[PDB]
A paper describes a structure:
We analysed a multidomain xylanase (Xyl) from the hindgut metagenome of the snouted harvester termite Trinervitermes trinervoides that releases xylobiose and xylotriose from beech and birch xylan and wheat arabinoxylan. The four domains of Xyl include an N-terminal GH11 xylanase domain, two family 36-like carbohydrate-binding domains CBM36-1 and 2, and a C-terminal CE4 esterase domain. Xyl exemplifies a “beads-on-a-string” protein where the individual domains are “beads” each connected by a linker (string), with each domain retaining its individual function- making the synthesis of novel super enzymes for rapid and efficient degradation of bio-waste to biofuels within reach.
Xyl bears two family 36 carbohydrate binding modules (CBM) sharing 84% sequence identity. CBM36-1 consists of 10 β-strands and a short α-helix between the first two β-strands. Electron density for two metal ions were identified in CBM36-1 and modelled as Ca2+. Metal ion site 1 or Ca2+-1 is adjacent to the sole α-helix, while Ca2+-2 is in a depression at one end of the jellyroll. Ca2+-1 is coordinated by main chain carbonyl oxygen atoms of Gly286 and Asp376, and the side chains of Gln267, Glu269 and Asp376, whereas Ca2+-2 is coordinated by carbonyl groups of Tyr291 and Trp371, and side chains of Asp367 and Asp 372. The flexible loop Ala366-Asp367-Asn368-Gly369 also contributes to ligand binding.
Residue numbers in the entry: 262 to 385
């Protein structure tokens, strides 16, 4: 009923997307359009999405959730300590869907560190 996809296993995109080791094994998104994405098979259309990550500092980091090219919501991190952020009851298509995690709100004040994406609901 839950599946976890490590961000470091996803396909990198953008200018500077890179791997990090601390505060967890994961990926850093440093600027706008820095992203990771992968193909998620879905047998049904409604899931909760939880991203574990954090800012690199005390400023608020944000990561956008995209599915099938549609922006479905934004994960927010109010500091540098690793935390989960859940976006509940996201509707989306079935079959193979491209899940994208992308920075769009960078302004030179923070980087987004992302550990894993957890998807909850009706068969992991
Ligand atoms: Ca940045
Ligand atoms: Ca990870």
């Amino acid at each position: 009923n839950e599946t976890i996809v490590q961000c470091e296993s996803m396909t990198k995109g953008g200018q500077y997307t890179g791997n990090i080791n601390n505060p967890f094994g994961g990926v850093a998104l440093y600027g706008n359009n820095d992203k990771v994405s992968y193909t998620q098979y879905f047998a049904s259309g409604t899931h909760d999405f939880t991203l574990r990550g954090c800012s690199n500092n005390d400023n608020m980091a944000r990561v956008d959730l995209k599915i099938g090219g549609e922006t479905k919501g934004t994960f927010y991190y109010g500091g540098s300590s690793p935390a989960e952020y859940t976006i509940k009851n996201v509707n989306h298509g079935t079959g193979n869907q491209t899940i994208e995690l992308v920075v769009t709100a960078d302004n030179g004040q923070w980087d987004a560190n992302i550990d894993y994406l957890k998807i909850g609901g009706a068969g992991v």
